[PDB]
Structures are given as C-alpha cells and as structure tokens.
Design an enzyme around this catalytic site. Structure first.
Site, PDB file in Angstrom:
ATOM      1  N   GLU A  61      -2.630  11.147   0.009  1.00 25.38           N
ATOM      2  CA  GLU A  61      -1.405  11.577   0.737  1.00 25.38           C
ATOM      3  C   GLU A  61      -0.290  12.382   0.006  1.00 25.38           C
ATOM      4  OE1 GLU A  61      -0.451   7.944   3.110  1.00 25.38           O
ATOM      5  OE2 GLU A  61      -2.430   7.669   3.691  1.00 25.38           O
ATOM      6  N   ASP A  97       3.887   0.026   4.181  1.00 31.59           N
ATOM      7  CA  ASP A  97       2.869  -0.496   4.605  1.00 31.59           C
ATOM      8  C   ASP A  97       2.130  -1.363   3.628  1.00 31.59           C
ATOM      9  OD1 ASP A  97       0.611  -1.039   5.873  1.00 31.59           O
ATOM     10  OD2 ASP A  97      -0.211   1.311   5.913  1.00 31.59           O
ATOM     11  N   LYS A 122      -2.793   6.647  15.994  1.00 33.85           N
ATOM     12  CA  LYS A 122      -4.196   7.393  15.241  1.00 33.85           C
ATOM     13  C   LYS A 122      -4.722   8.020  16.434  1.00 33.85           C
ATOM     14  CE  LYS A 122      -3.772   4.946  10.884  1.00 33.85           C
ATOM     15  NZ  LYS A 122      -4.255   3.796   9.714  1.00 33.85           N
ATOM     16  N   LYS A 139       4.488   9.842  10.424  1.00 33.99           N
ATOM     17  CA  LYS A 139       3.878   9.225   9.255  1.00 33.99           C
ATOM     18  C   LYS A 139       2.813  10.232   8.848  1.00 33.99           C
ATOM     19  CE  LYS A 139       1.349   5.758   7.737  1.00 33.99           C
ATOM     20  NZ  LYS A 139       0.875   4.272   7.687  1.00 33.99           N
ATOM     21  N   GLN A 194       0.823  -1.285   0.081  1.00 32.83           N
ATOM     22  CA  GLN A 194       0.074  -0.100   0.050  1.00 32.83           C
ATOM     23  C   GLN A 194       0.907   1.490   0.023  1.00 32.83           C
ATOM     24  OE1 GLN A 194      -4.122   0.451   1.983  1.00 32.83           O
ATOM     25  NE2 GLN A 194      -2.551   1.596   3.334  1.00 32.83           N
ATOM     26  N   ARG A 196      -4.325  10.626   8.994  1.00 31.53           N
ATOM     27  CA  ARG A 196      -5.321   9.717   8.154  1.00 31.53           C
ATOM     28  C   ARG A 196      -5.370  10.136   6.807  1.00 31.53           C
ATOM     29  NH1 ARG A 196      -8.500   6.866  11.879  1.00 31.53           N
ATOM     30  NH2 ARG A 196      -8.660   5.388  10.001  1.00 31.53           N
ATOM     31  N   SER A 197      -6.078   9.589   5.906  1.00 35.78           N
ATOM     32  CA  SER A 197      -6.216   9.811   4.594  1.00 35.78           C
ATOM     33  C   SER A 197      -7.086  10.982   4.438  1.00 35.78           C
ATOM     34  CB  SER A 197      -6.940   8.692   3.790  1.00 35.78           C
ATOM     35  OG  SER A 197      -8.331   8.503   4.342  1.00 35.78           O
ATOM     36  N   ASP A 238      -0.379  -1.427  12.566  1.00 34.68           N
ATOM     37  CA  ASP A 238      -1.454  -0.480  12.339  1.00 34.68           C
ATOM     38  C   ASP A 238      -2.835  -0.990  12.603  1.00 34.68           C
ATOM     39  OD1 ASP A 238      -3.234   1.544  11.300  1.00 34.68           O
ATOM     40  OD2 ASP A 238      -2.231   1.346   9.287  1.00 34.68           O
ATOM     41  N   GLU A 281       4.986  -2.153   8.071  1.00 34.87           N
ATOM     42  CA  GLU A 281       3.823  -2.110   8.735  1.00 34.87           C
ATOM     43  C   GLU A 281       2.724  -3.002   8.199  1.00 34.87           C
ATOM     44  OE1 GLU A 281       1.973   2.106   9.129  1.00 34.87           O
ATOM     45  OE2 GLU A 281       0.179   1.315   8.535  1.00 34.87           O
TER      46      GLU A 281
HETATM   47 MG   LIG Z   1      -1.793   1.117   7.248  1.00 38.98          MG
END
Ligand SMILES: [Mg+2]
Ligand SMILES: [Mg+2]
Ligand SMILES: [Mg+2]
Ligand SMILES: [Mg+2]
Lengths: 423, 423, 423, 423
Positions: A203, A240, A337, A388, A161, A366-367, A312, A285
């Site tokens: 992102e 990730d 998060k 991150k 990802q 977050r996205s 995560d 991740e």
């Molecule tokens: Mg993730």
C-alpha cells in the site's frame, strides 16, 4: 437509447501486486464506453472467481470470470438502460443466483457494475461523482494514509497492521495531500538516517524493523514534526489493529503474535484507551476480534464517544452484519470495500445504512488495486468524508488522490473539506 | 474546426514516488479532451521546472510549470489543429526559446504535447498508437522487467543497478506478461525462503541484501526455473550497469563503489564478456561511462555482435549525441525517455534516427511515473519491439502492461510479438 | 457504423500503356468511397488475373478479376471495418485460397486493398499517408528518375536498362523535383543537338541511339552540367542493370545481349566497382542474376559498404526471398512493388522486414501505371526515403511527383527531405 | 452557407511534359474541396502567366500566378456561392481588368474556375457532368485519337500534324475505347515489323520515319485491318492539318515545309478533296490558314456537306472569331480549348454558340496535360459527341478515357453513344 447497453466485454488484466484481475468495458448504443475493474484483497462476503489452473498465474487466472462477462452477463445486460444501475446490478444478481456472486464471480459483477456507471456518467456528460451523488456531492474525504506497516506480513516486531496519518488541519484536499507527502518523505529520511529500510509494501508504506506499536507511533509523530507540523492540530493517527489475527486461547482472549503480550478482551480495550490518552489517535480499526461482539459492545461504551471504532473484518461490508452491529451498539464506523459486496448499488445501500445509524463510512482500497479511481468518486458522491487508500506512493494509491485533486478542482467553491469535523 | 484547440490547462498531481508532477488537459472545439502527464527521474537533456519552495513539497512543487500551461502555452496553442503535433510542439519550442525547455519547463511542454496527441487521437476516433504510427503500427514490445535492484540506493552489495528478465520465448505479449508475473512471484518466494526482503523499490522490484551481481543473476535464474521456464529458451537477461556512477581517478578507469573492484575500460568490457558467456545476458545498458566514447567504440567492437549495448546516459534521448554515437560506432541501441527530450514529435525523430541506423530503441519509464500509459502506445506506434517499464508490480508500471494487453487485443491477428527476433 | 463496408465494385480501366487493368471502388456506410487500381508489368510473385480472350484487348482483358470483385470479394468484405486493413486483406487472402492470389487475381485483390485504405483514410478525415504511417510519417523520398533507357526494349546499343538521376543536394522535395525537370529538358536539348530521338518510352525517359552504358552516363552527366548542377553535390546516378536479362551459358556467367561482352560474377562486380569509382553512381539495381546468390553475397561484401545494391528481380517483393537475402547478406536494399505482393498490409510487412534488417526500401512503379498515386503516400507513410516512379514526364509518372508536392506542403515544417542521407 | 467559398489556394505542379502549371484547390464552408488545373499548349487567346525567371524551370515557373490565386483571387471569391460559376468567373474577370486575363494569368483563372465547379458539384453531391449539364447530359463523345504524328516536331517526312482514328461503329464508349487500344497496339506491332520507332510523342502517339501523309494513312488503315476492323464501318479518320504552319509567300498560298509542295488556297482544298475520296477521312482540322477566310469560306462550300472542317487556330476558342466564321460560313466545327478562353462559363458560352449555329464542338486537350479529367465531364455535360484527347497511352490522356468509362457506367441505360451519327 444512447444509454442503452449494446455489448459488455471482460478482460484479464494485472493488479498492483502482479496478480490477475477483471476489467470490464461497457459499450452503449451512442458509442460511449465505460471501464471498471475489480480490486482484490472469507465467508460473509462476495466471492471473487479464480481459475485455479496451477499452470497459469499460480492458479489465480480470471479467464472464467472474463468468459462470464463476455457471454452470460453481456446477453443479460444488452438492451438495458445503463443509467439504471440498480436494475443492472439486480439483473446480474438474479442471473447469478447465489448469495455471494460465486457463479459469475464478485469480480466480474463488480467490474461490470462500475463500468456501467462510468458509461452512464459519460453518456450523460457528467462526472461519476455527480452521476452517483448528484448536486449534493461536495465533500472531499479526509484520507487516512498507511505510511508505516506492521502485523502479519511485515519484517518487524510491530503487531498493529496499519499506522495512518490523517491531515485533519488542512482546509482543502489539495493542502491535505501535499502535507501528507511531506510527512511521508520526512518519515523516509528519518528511517534512512537510522539505517532502516525505505522500500515499500503493497500500500506504498514503509515496513522498517521497529520494536513495537509504540515505537512506530513515535516514528510517525517524529516524521510529522520533522515535516513542520503539529500532532493534534495538523495530523492525528488512525490504526488498523486487525486484532482478528491476534486470536488467543478462547473468545475474549488475545495474544499478539510478535509481542506475545496477552490481553483479556477488556484489557485490550484498556490498552487502546491508554494508547489514545498517550497519543493523538482518533480512530482504531478492528480493535477487537471479528466475533467478539460482547467485547465490541464494551469497547464502544468505553471508547466510542471519543474514538472512531471502525469495523473492517467485523462487518465485511455485509449489511446483515452492519445491522447486527448497529442494533447491539458495536462500532461507530464501517470500512467500505466495494468488492466485498460486489455491486455499486449494493455499496450505496450499505453506506446509506451506516449513515442512517450515525456510523461513518470510510471508503477503502484493497491490497491488490489497479489504476481504477472509482472509490475517489464514490467517497465524494456520498460525502463520506473519509477515505483509506494507501500511502502517497505507488500509483494505484496515488491515482485515487489525483482523482480527488481533479474533483476538488471541478467542484470550485462548492468543495468542502471537513478536516476534524469529519468524525 | 473540431480538431481546433480551444484551451489548455495544467495541474499539479502526485507521481508514483509521492512527488509533484505536471498534468495537462487539452480541450478541443469539438468537445473532446486529452490528458497527458510528465514523468520524472543532467546537462544535455531538457530541464524539468520545479518551484524550489522549501515550504511546499520540499521545493519540488510544479505550480510554475502549471501556470505556464494555464496562461502562456494555452494562449499560444489555442486555434491550432491538435492533430498537427509537429506544429503544436514547434510552437511551444519556439515560444520557449531555450535549448533545454527551461522557460516553460520540459515537464509542462511534454505534458501538453502528450495531451494534444491524445486529444487528436480521440477526436479522430482512433487509438493513440494508430494516431502515432498509423496502420503500420502492430509490433508489441518485448518487456525488460526490473525485478531485482542493485547499485546506488539499494540495501546490498550489488553494483549493477537493474537486473531484468525478458520473455523472449513467448508468442504473444499476453503470454509474455503472464510468464513474467510467474517468475516475479517465484523470485519473491525464493527471497522469502532465504529470509530476504520482499518489499519493493521505485520500479516494483526487490532489493534484497545480495552479495554480488553474480548472486543477483543466479537468484533470477533460479526463479526462472522455479516458475517452470528455461533460461535461454524462455527468458534472457538485460542489465543496467549505470556505469557512469562508477567514475574513476582518470577517464577510462572505473571503480565499482561497493565491490571496490578497479577496471580500465578494456578490462570492464572484458568483464561484461565473461558474464555474457556464463549467463544468458543479451543486453547491457550503459556498460561504460557517458563520456568514455573510445571505450564505447571499443566495447561495441568487442560485443556489439552478440550483445545489445544500450546507451541510456550515453545519449540522454539527445539526437546530437545519438548521431555522434552512430558516427563513431558507439552502442547499437538507445533508451528512449520522452521527458529527456520533452516533446512527442522530437521523440519520434529520435526513434527514427535510431532505426535508420540499425539501433534498437527501448522505450522507457522513469523512476517517478504516473497512471499515464503513453509509452505503451509509443512502443507499438513505432514498432520498437522493446519496452523498459518496470517489474510487474505497482500500477504506474503495470498500467503500461495492461495497456499493451488492450492493444494486442485490439490488433487481433495483425498483432506481432517478436520475441527473440526483436534484437 | 461509418467505417463499415457496404459494397465493393470493380471496373476495367486502361493503363498508361494502353492495356486493361483493374480499378476498385469501396463504399462505406457513412457515404464515403475509396478508389484504388492495380498497376502491372512470374513464379515467386502474386499473379494477376487476365481473361485470355483474344477477341478482346488482345487477350489482356480483366473482366474476370472485375467480376471477382463485384461478387465474391464484395460479399466477403461487406460488413467489415475498412480501417482494419489487415483483417480485410486477410479475408481476401483466405477466401482466395491460393498462395499467389491466382484465384481472385492479384490485380483484383490489390485494387480493393488500396481502395479500402483510401476509403478508411477519407472516412477518418486524414491523408492516406497519415492513415498508413500516422504522425510518424514525414519523410519525403528522394526520387531516382529514369531519364535515359537501355536494355531489352530499347532501340539502342545500351545494355543497362534504366539510368536514373537522384537530386541528393536539394533541401526540399519541391526543389528536388524542379531540378530533376531542369536536367530532363537539358538532356532533351542535348539529344536534339546531336540529332537523336527525344520521344519517350513507357516510363517517360528517352531511348536515344547511344553507343554504350558509358556514353549514356556521360550524356546524363552532361545534362546535369548543362542544367547548372554539379555531379556529386547536386546529383548522383542510380542504375538498373536488370542483369537477370544477361544470362550466360552457365550460372555465374553473364553475356550482355547487345555488347556481347562476357563476365564472371566476380568480373561483373569489378566492372560495377570501376564504373562507381569513375562516375558518381550510388545505387545499382540487380547488378547480378536473380539466382546468383553466391555472387550477390560476394558483390555485397565488395561493394555493399559504398554502394546501394537493390534487389528487384532478386527479391520480387517476396518476404521469403528477402529473408534469404538477409540471412545470406545479399543486397542492402529492396525494390518494393505493391502488386507483386498484392495487398497493402503485406507490403507494409515486407518494408518492415527490410527496415529491421537495415535494408532500404525503394517504393516502385510498374511499366503499366495509372493515374493512381498510392505509392507517393506509401513512400512517405513508411518514411522509405526513396521512390522510383519514372522520368518527370507522362502523368502516370508525374502524378506521383505532384502528390508528393501536396504532401510536402501539408507537412509544413515537419517535412524532412533527407537528400544524400537517405542511403 | 455550405456552398460559400472560404478559401482558394494555388500551387505550382508539373504537367505531362515536365513543365510547371497551376493547380487550384477551392475550400467551401461546409468542408468540401475542389481541385482544378490549367493545361498548357497567341494573340487572340487568353494569356497564361509565366514567371520568366531563367533560374527556375527555364523561365517557365508559375509562382506569380499561384500568388495571384493565394492572395487576390482568394480574397475576391471568399464568401461567394461556389455553385454560381458565372458570377465567380465574372468576379475574376473584372478583378483582372484585362481582355486576355493577362494580369492574374489565364492559367490561374481557369484553375480556380474548374476547382469551383468541382467543389460545387461535390457539395451538391452530384458528378461534375450533372453539375455542368444537368439531367440533360448523357452523350458519351466519339474520341478522335492522335496515334500517328507528323508536322513540325517530328522525325519524319509527314506534313500533316495529327492523324487520328475515330471508332464510329461502336455501340458504347466502352466498346469504342477497347477497339481503339487494339488498333493502337496493332499499329505498334506493324511499326515494329518495319523496324520503325515505337516510342511516343506528347499525346501518346507514334512518330515513326514515314515518307508522306498517304503513308501514315495507309499504315493506320493497315493497323485497323490487322486489329480486325473495317475502314468505313468500324473506323474512320480525322486529321489536324495545322495548315497555319504552312505560311506561303502571300495570303492564299501554302508551302509544305517537308514536301516543299506549293499550293494555292483553292488547290489545297482540291487536295483534301481527293484524299477524302481516296480514304475514309471524315474530319479535317485547320485545312487552311488561320486568316484565310475567303479560303475557308470556299473550302466550306466545297467540302462542308461531306466533311467536318474544324477550326482550331482559326477560332482559338474566341467567340468573336467563331461568330465571324459563322457569319461568313467558314468551317462547320470548332476545337474547344478551355485554357484559350480561360473560364468554365465562357467555355460553355462558346459551345452554346457553336451548337446554336450547327457547328460541332470538339472538346480538346493541350500538349501539356495533367491527371485532371475535367474535359471528359465537359464533353458529356454539353453532349458535344466528340472529344480530342490523345492516343490511348500516357495517363494524362488515358485518364480522360477512364473517366468517360466511369461516366458511361454511372449513366446506365440513359447513356447514348452516337458513333457515326455524331457529325
Ligand atoms: Mg483491516
Ligand atoms: Mg539507466
Ligand atoms: Mg528492375
Ligand atoms: Mg491543331
């Protein structure tokens, strides 16, 4: 008394993806204000509250959450000391009465939690990171920047990802940021020269049509060299996998959606190990499923001593899940998060738990993000040493990096940038 | 005393594209501070100052501009009344002594100018729009949102650069912005259904591989309908032809670089006319070249009655060029870019020149933007009724929209959203 | 807290003509007060409240309006934020309940409205023009000074009501005002040499026994010459014909009440056309009847491009009427009378409506003025560029010119005097 | 120290006749300011400084005086306590060096003086009259209003210069003022019915073409009656004979320039004597020449006990001359003109001297007035019981009446209006 909360309001603003989210503003008796927002990305996490009205925002309105801030939360918090964030958070948690903040909305609650902390910091005449972490706050985080995208929602054959660069060789955060932007633009020019798309995802990173994880890695490594830097010394990689999206036929079995490669839990681990010997990847991740605890145990034995293994989805910033991982020796890092847990103070606790167990805490975006830069201060406040928060493009990402510039500036000679010592 | 500037500092931050830009912070005697930043996107415009050091940011550093703030500009402005922005700006203009602000850097100058305004507004306890435009400031702008890209650096066959929706039917900015996001996501889904790319460009819109300006238009119109809205009553369209990038053999001749179609000015004009008869297009920016003054005059005769004709490159926020256009009946609207002129007060003068002549003033972003939301306040302060600040994605765009939300809230019943009457 | 209205009081003062009018004083929590008054001179306008008791002031007392302030209006506004003048105006308008402010009285309502703006401005520590128009306010208006009078209440054979000089050649308001005084004394010396009366009317101007409009004009042009100035370069003339006083036997017909000369609308228009070719007349107020819309439409066609045609009785500072003017293309300017509309905020809207349609807005005095100088600030605030406020004699006139001096001085180099470009 | 003068500025403004005069603003350390202006109307008075540049204001400019304030006076007063007016005035007098304030200009000096007193009062948070006169100040003055003009500059055959009414029967200043306005409008109406001119002169009064002093008097008495009032009970009359303008062939002889009538000093007295028998005339100003001391001494013997005999030109607000009058028993009243003596404190001393000797002190305007209302407060501050400040029209006059309304209002039950008992 100057720290006494007078009024809390909410408002429906728009996040970086064009969807609504919650913003709160806390007003203190002294006329100082604080403003916070909730980012947006489950069953083991705090649940954000959406309107569901198909006629507004495709059902994603947050007018209910906003109404909760304006009426119930305001009345609850009025009169309280904004510097006592634990007590503020606890008043909201108890009034909400659920385990997942589903009555008020984790988004309402977080937004107020942050707004208060910011109000208190300002009222006290201190930066938020000094409010949160005190004099002891002086570590600038090493950023992992997601500059190449694959996985579920990318237009390519790449299964992993996120592909991230970490500027482990720089000696200030300012230098690390600069270098990252240089690698970023090198990668763009390289993709361009090969006829590939340089438009960006959520992102701020690229999602070109590359063949596989390995080719993505080599594009990044090439970008690094083109920028004038050395893999290993200057830059290393984090990834990730988000392997919870690779569910095979049963537990312990993995099928990559695009590659169609099949892995036994233990062969996937073997795969990661070869990738890590081939290339300077120092962190991975979600290298196994959110429930392959037996796998995580093995992987952490096999790889844990050399590779950072970040949970995560494994942990969803849930301290009961973090504790289970600690006890069963799964992972050695956790992705933090804020909004999965729902309050500032709960997040501090989660990070304290990880740090006590020798896990690293990578503070995370977050996205769906906003202009808000709280996680920058949070990462420094607790000296997490890693963050991150996206490629260095799109200001909901870049804003965090700017905030870290300012903080590093403000710390003067007390500022520490840990580079490779951060893991 | 309390409005007295004590100190001005600058810093090199990163913009929405991953390139350096300038930030200034103004400190007043009273303890209040103000922060401003320079966006980044010629020969008749103010010049941004870059370092040219290929070892840093590929030559795009702005440490020199920052040192101009920290030393020269700070020493000049210290002691001055931050609320006297005209005087602050003049001190910088005079001390710079060039025509294009090339001594300090138009980026250094603008950053400081904005920071002062923001410091002064804060010190007086008023929002920025009130500081700039007083009690008289109450018009929220109708946004033109660039959700579909063509031209220059697009991966497609579309020649027109920006295709924009304007929510003219809404009765509040809040409603307008909601509807715009709804059309945004409907377009995204449309593109997805047709197998097209939904990653985004600089300004947050999509640059899918479409075949013609006509196809881009119909996708947007389809999206409008999918969202549940009517072309004409709810949404109309604005475009940025950017037709200076269509240079021909001789002046007056045009060649679309993708289409390869050849126009003489009069023919190009006639082209716009058909499009405007077929589709609900109400505004065309740079419909002719930045020096084709005869054609502009002609086009304005042909179209100016029904269509808005925005001079972007035509005027480069230059009041001499604007005046020329006014004198020769070219265009009926001007795109206002703070950083093309380089100070706040000069931008007010440009907007006042336009308004006195019956030209509309569209307050505009640049491709490189930051977290800064000054143009939101600027748009409302001078009641311009229109703003061009991107698709509703990427927070360097959306933060402006969020600021306009907060402003509409703050104005209460006095807020006016002009819709279709804004033209 | 500090902008909160504690108390509003009214008092009965005397105007420049020796009749009662209303004064308001607004008191804020912070200890600041603001003072405003209503001037005075209908059916489409806000209606002032007079007492009607023939025992007092010949029926023109204003103790009822004053009691409306001390009780109802003070009670209503107490607790409100004086800086939110739209909200304040609205509260008054809504409590009054009528369409024309007939219950509280338009004199009461305007007085308080002004008093609040002044209170807010003072509390914020800014000049009134900065509070009203913000940093954007820097245009000193060109005055049209009524130094020779004819019409209804003048003892001479001159049918045209006001004959005004406009110092268009000057480079500062300071210079402009000085030249005006100089022409004023020259005319006096001229009238004296011809055996004519040099006592003054309501507005500080002379009403010498002259034969006709043409003679009046030639005397003024002579004064100009005597004073050392050139008609055209230095001074041009504006006139108020007040032709609504010239009603013929049927609509569309005019008979000058002294002259007895007769006209058809289209004929009267040719009369203005010649006067304007013969003399340097650049503006004509009410050149046709307040209800002769077809004639105005035609006059604006014929003269509109060369001459300013100001609607006074045509519009009565009524936005419905001004809008009708705009839709039917009648006039290109409007005379703005605060008290006809009755609140500060509504006056801003009327001016905004005018500017948006390309009309100029001439801020105007009433025959019954006071020491108040609000219209001076109002004119600079909205950069109207023109003000009509009397001959340079009688301090209810001169007080405004003095305030403009102070304003210009305070603006320093930011001050713009548009001279001939104001039209 | 908050009463410490930081800065004094001057400015050239315009008076009620369209001629330049001096305004001063005094700035105190604590941020408070005060504004004062010199009005304008000899050998024994302080001399106002005019520029004499024939190219500006016909030589009547006051920029020289203004520069005297801006540099020399400001430099001298800086650091001084603004509440110590005697010392401020003394500093200016000593720096000037002359006996008539001819170096700085009596106009510059008085403007500053007044500005300080006003600044001091503001800084103390007290009304100007309380500053000047303390708790002891509570007598509203009886106005003598010049509603009918004769003498030199007058288009008639009246030799007496000013014909004034005095509301002696009223129980409050508010009632008095109202009654005066009513008499004023009745006279206007009366005058109109006779085809007589109703435009006004410098002081707001009429100058119709009447034949003799007796006529003027009867018209006024007629006006009084029409308004509904009784001579004696409600209104009495005062007159400014200004007999210094009647210079005879030798000292002791008078020749009325209009009547051409000849008088011996002692015959003139007999004339006044009859008039007062024939009419309700309670006061006569300058009934004999400004040097005819034997005359005055005689007149004072003849009339003093029944009639107020006011020295205007006789004393020119000069204490040496007032003392001489007192010692030789000439007159029993004095017209006080601030700008004739040139400072506030010196003015107080003049009034104290008159009061000591049982003279009344009539506080007076000049023909060239402004929006300034200082003499209103002065009159109350020293309980003079009498004021001469014009007809109730023209706001340079009416502003004083309005300020006295406010003062009376502010005094509540402690306000004393003397009426007939004031002589
Ligand atoms: Mg993730
Ligand atoms: Mg463009
Ligand atoms: Mg009129
Ligand atoms: Mg006299």
């Amino acid at each position: 008394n100057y720290l006494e909360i007078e009024k809390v309001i909410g408002r429906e603003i728009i996040d970086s993806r064009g969807n609504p989210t919650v913003e709160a503003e806390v007003y203190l008796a002294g006329g100082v204000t604080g403003r916070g927002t909730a980012p947006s990305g489950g069953e083991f996490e705090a649940l954000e509250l959406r309107d569901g009205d198909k006629g507004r925002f495709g059902g994603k309105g947050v007018t209910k959450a906003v109404q909760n801030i304006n009426t119930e939360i305001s009345e609850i918090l009025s009169g309280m000391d904004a510097s006592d964030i634990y007590a503020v958070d606890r008043a909201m948690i108890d009034a909400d009465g659920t385990k997942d903040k589903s009555k008020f909305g984790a988004n309402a609650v977080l937004a107020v939690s942050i707004a208060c902390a910011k109000a208190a910091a300002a009222a006290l005449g201190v930066p938020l990171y000094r409010f949160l972490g005190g004099l002891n706050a002086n570590r600038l985080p090493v950023p992992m920047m997601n500059i190449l995208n694959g996985g579920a929602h990318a237009a390519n054959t790449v299964d992993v990802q996120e592909f991230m660069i970490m500027p482990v060789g720089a000696e200030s955060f300012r230098e690390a940021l600069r270098q990252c932007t240089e690698v970023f633009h090198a990668l763009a020019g390289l993709l361009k020269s090969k006829g590939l798309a340089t438009s960006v995802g959520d992102e701020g990173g690229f999602a070109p049509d590359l063949a596989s994880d390995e080719e993505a890695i080599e594009y990044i490594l090439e970008a690094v060299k083109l920028a004038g830097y050395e893999p290993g010394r200057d830059f290393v990689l984090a990834m990730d996998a988000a392997s919870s999206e690779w569910k095979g036929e049963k537990k312990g079995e993995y099928i990559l959606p695009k590659c169609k490669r099949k892995f036994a839990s233990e062969e996937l681990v073997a795969h990661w190990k070869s990738l890590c010997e081939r290339y300077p990847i120092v962190s991975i991740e979600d290298g196994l499923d959110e429930e392959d605890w037996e796998g995580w145990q093995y992987m952490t034995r096999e790889l844990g001593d050399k590779i950072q293994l970040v949970g995560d989805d494994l942990f969803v910033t849930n301290t009961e899940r973090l504790n289970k991982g600690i006890k069963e020796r799964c992972g050695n890092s956790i992705l933090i998060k804020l909004n999965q847990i729902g309050t500032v103070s709960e997040t501090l606790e989660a990070i304290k738990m990880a740090h006590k167990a020798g896990y690293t805490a990578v503070v995370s975006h977050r996205s769906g993000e906003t202009e808000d830069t709280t996680i920058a201060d949070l990462a420094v406040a607790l000296n997490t040493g890693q963050i991150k928060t996206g490629a260095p493009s799109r200001s909901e990402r870049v804003a965090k990096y700017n905030q870290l510039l300012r903080i590093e500036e403000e710390l003067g000679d007390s500022a520490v940038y840990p580079g490779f010592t951060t893991f």
